[PDB]
Design a protein around this ligand. Structure first.
Ligand SMILES: COC(=O)N[C@H](C(=O)NN(CCC[C@@]1(O)Cc2ccc(cc2)C/C=C\CNC(=O)[C@H](C(C)C)NC1=O)Cc1ccc(-c2cccs2)cc1)C(C)(C)C
Ligand SMILES: [Cl-]
Ligand SMILES: [Cl-]
Ligand SMILES: [Cl-]
Lengths: 99, 99
């Protein structure tokens, strides 16, 4: 679709059998979700933003569906104050900025 | 332009006659720049990021050029990891998300 930026660009995602609301963030390197369970291997990571760093768990090769577009990539899980979809997945669904 | 997201969506902005690099960030309500000088009076704002809260100085009605596109709006100044261009100015320069 074309998505306006008068409001926050929130979309439904499907991940780990769950439906969630998330924020399409062109500024984010990574995808970061609030605490949830995912299968398979993980390793710790510190990620930074406004206000400083938080510690997250990094899972790789996770299937995700965003606005009905399938992709696979790394998903970070931790105490983020909101679900963000980052460039690592935005690329896979062909998402671009236009002006 | 159309900007893909394989790399950080970094652009040149001009503010107060000087060039800077900044990140086009659709997950940001507000525009936040690293410490700099701006004219007039400022008001306080507390803004929240992935890592927690920071205090910033809010300047209103500031002219700023973003990739050659002219805007005039609210600019927050404070301890941010990078210069971030948020939806308040992205809407002024006619930005959308497309996939
Ligand atoms: C309305 O609040 C905001 O719009 N906050 C904004 C904001 O933090 N939005 N959050 C989106 C993510 C912003 C940012 O792209 C902002 C950003 C920060 C640093 C960088 C690049 C972009 C470069 C440094 C390291 C790489 N870090 C990141 O890529 C991280 C990523 C790992 C999450 N990127 C970001 O953190 C998402 C977000 C949204 C809401 C809140 C709230 C929490 C509680 C109250 S508000 C926190 C985070 C703002 C920049 C104005 C502080
Ligand atoms: Cl990835
Ligand atoms: Cl592409
Ligand atoms: Cl504004």
């Amino acid at each position: 679709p074309q998505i306006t930026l008068w409001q926050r660009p929130l979309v439904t995602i499907k991940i780990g059998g769950q439906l969630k609301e998330a924020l399409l963030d062109t500024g984010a390197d990574d995808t970061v979700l609030e605490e949830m369970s995912l299968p398979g291997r993980w390793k710790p990571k510190m990620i930074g933003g406004i206000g400083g760093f938080i510690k997250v768990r990094q899972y790789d090769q996770i299937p995700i569906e965003i606005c009905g577009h399938k992709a696979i990539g790394t998903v970070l899980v931790g105490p983020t104050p909101t679900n963000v979809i980052g460039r690592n997945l935005l690329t896979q669904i062909g998402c671009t900025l236009n002006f």
